[PDB]
Each structure stands twice: as C-alpha cells, then as structure tokens.
Symmetry: C2
Subunit: 205 residues, 2 copies
C-alpha cells in the first residue's frame, strides 16, 4: 500500500549533476505529476513537506506561464478497468475510486493539458511523446509525487526518448525523506538533472 | 563512469515479494542482459560475484532450454552514432568501441535471439515487445548486469507493458552489494518478483 506518510522536511541540499544541462524556455514543458487529492491525502497536507512543495510548484507554474513554457498535468482516472490497470493491481490493489481532482492550489487552467495516467511513466498509454516531438519540445521539468515511483519512471522514459529530464528536488515529495533523497541521487547519477526550484526559476528566466 | 567494481558476494537472502507470481514455462522468456565482455570486464571475472553469477545464468539457460523457454540476449553495438546514442553520452561518454561479444561461458546458440541494445530498457528501439506479444509470452525472466540500471529499467518497462518481470537475485550483479540489494528491494516492492536461481529452476520444472 501507499503508507500514511509521516511528516518530513523537503531537502534543501541536492546531489551534484553529471550533466551541465540548463532549462531553456523555448525547449521545455513543465509536468505536474499526480498532484491529485487521492495521492496528496496520504500526507498530512498541513505538515512538511506539503506546504513548501505546493508553494514551489505554484511558483514554477507561474514562472513557466510567464516564460511561455507549456504546463501538463497527469492524473489517474477512478475505477480503472482491471484489464487496463493490469499488473498494478497486484502491487497496489484496485486503485482510486474518488479524490481524482488535482489539488486546488495547483488547479489546471484552460490552456494546461491534462493527461490520463495509466502507468508509472507518464509516457505509457498517452500522447505525451508524440506531443513533445510534434512541438519540438525536448526538455521535461518534472514536479509532483512520488519521487521514487512515477517521477523516476517518467524521467527514465523521457531520458530514453531523448528528452532531457529536470527533476525539481524541492518540487517533488515521496514516502519518506530517505526515499526522496535516494531518488534524487539516482536521477542525478543516471537519468536526468536535479535542480532546485530557485535554480530552475533562474534558468527559465 | 562505470567504476572498477570491487569484489563482493552475491546475495543469498532476497526480499519478500508483494506478488505471488510463479514462472510458467509456457509463458516465459529468459533474458540474458548485457553479458558482454565490455561490461563484465569492469569486474575481476575471477572474483565474486562473477563465477557464481555465470554458473547461475548457465544453469538457468540450460533449464530454460529443457523446458522450452526461449532465450534472448541483449548487447550494445560498438561505436554508436552520437545521434543514436543521444543523452547516454552525457552520462557515460561515447560508449564501447570493442569487447562487444557475449562472454564465452554464456555463448548464444543458434536459436537464441540476439537483440541490439540502445537504451537502459531492452524494449526501447527493439522488437522485444512485438515479439513477446506475437508469441503470447507474458513473463520475462531477467538476468545479467547491472541490477540498478538496465535490469531495473527493463523490468519497469516489462511491468508497464503487462509482462510479469522475474528478476533473479543471484542471477544479476551490480556496481556494489549495496546497489545490488537496493535494486532487488525496489523491484520486489514496485515492479516485479525477485526469485533465487534455485527457486526459478523449481518453478520452471
Ligand atoms: C503517484 C503515483 O502513483 C503510483 C504510486 C502508488 C500507487 C499507484 C496506483 O495505485 O496506481 C500508482 O501506480 C506515482 O506514479 O508515483
Ligand atoms: C550494462 C548496462 O549498460 C548501461 C550501464 C552503464 C553504461 C552504459 C553505456 O555506456 O551505454 C549503459 O547504458 C545496463 O544497461 O545496465
């Protein structure tokens, strides 16, 4: 199951990157990954890391808009058909039946694309890759939950599809600080660049 | 870079699985992943974990053959075009130029398929998924190196493509015992079943 997640502080220190990539507003898309009521409610939303996570994603979204970076959301649909949900059910059960809305502080606006999420990777069973390729966007800024699961899997697919992933270290959260930090170390070492919210904002500008 | 890998003992204790899946010879394919001279030579092949790794993979291959389970190998090609190698070069450099052969103790036979490996996941830029689907094989037994990189990424893709991954805990190796054990814990918790060589052999029979 997803645990009841004990409060923990968002990390400030981030791993060093092996790559020198920088976010370019002409190349990038901002993904807000699985910030649904369902997933967020495994935390106490009034306790760390959630207030600061939300603030950081809000800020990045506002800066993205100002810079002309498209924003895309992922969200799982309720009551997934067992044949379509497939092997996920063997790990997580039948899945959400409610609480599908994106949390209000991160409400999608009319021009923000909302993709249906079927697997850990946002690319699977979705038009994400075709859209990025059609529009010539080859950087994906990744925020949301959970760092070691769909954030990581989406970054791996992006990387393998020749899209530079930028995972925002204080713009994701996870089941624990340990899982969160290990995820960032894995990403920096193997499959993307990790940036702070402040650094990503500076690069976007 | 891939480190010069210090000797370490293959783990015997394996994590518990969340799933109750069992290998079925009518459903399964055995993947021997990146057991090329190039990758193996980052270890001392005469020191643990390599002699036991090789023995275990040899045994599984022989049992697979006896049980009618197809065997498939992956191998990276030498001197990859930078445009095709893409973002990998930013993490690992230009990649191998030599040492492309599968190590002799695991020599492919005439009926064993050899796929060209382009990304961490064996599915990317390959016919693997189409072949599995065409032939109705929906279990993938995974052996080889490195546990936390291509073994993990291949398992993630298989899982997301509705193929049950069985990662052989004492049939893979990695940059360190810690990386190896963490990989197995991740897999058992999130994206496949971990089996010992002995257990996989019993299930195959
Ligand atoms: C927020 C995520 O959803 C996954 C994690 C746990 C449970 C899940 C489920 O019930 O389907 C999702 O697959 C993520 O991909 O990180
Ligand atoms: C044995 C693997 O190759 C990868 C790991 C390190 C260096 C690699 C390279 O130079 O391309 C591979 O991407 C694996 O996928 O686990």
């Amino acid at each position: 199951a997803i645990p009841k997640i004990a409060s923990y502080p968002l990390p400030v220190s981030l791993p060093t990157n092996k790559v020198d990539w920088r976010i370019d507003a002409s190349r990038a898309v901002l993904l807000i990954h699985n910030m649904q009521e369902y997933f967020v409610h495994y935390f106490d939303s009034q306790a760390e890391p959630i207030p600061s996570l939300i603030k950081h994603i809000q800020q990045l979204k506002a800066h993205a808009k100002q810079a002309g970076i498209p924003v895309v959301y992922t969200a799982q649909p309720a009551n997934q058909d067992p044949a379509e949900r497939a092997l996920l059910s063997d790990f997580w059960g039948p899945g959400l039946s409610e609480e599908t809305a994106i949390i209000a502080p991160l409400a999608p606006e009319s021009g923000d694309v909302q993709l249906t999420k079927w697997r850990y990777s946002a690319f699977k069973k979705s038009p994400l890759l075709d859209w990025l390729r059609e529009t010539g966007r080859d950087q994906l800024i990744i925020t949301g939950v959970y760092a070691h699961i769909g954030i990581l899997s989406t970054a791996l697919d992006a990387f393998m599809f020749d899209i530079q992933p930028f995972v925002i270290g204080d713009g994701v959260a996870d089941f624990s600080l340990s899982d969160h930090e290990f995820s960032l170390r894995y990403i920096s070492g193997r499959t993307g660049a990790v940036k702070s919210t402040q650094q990503a904002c500076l690069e976007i500008a």
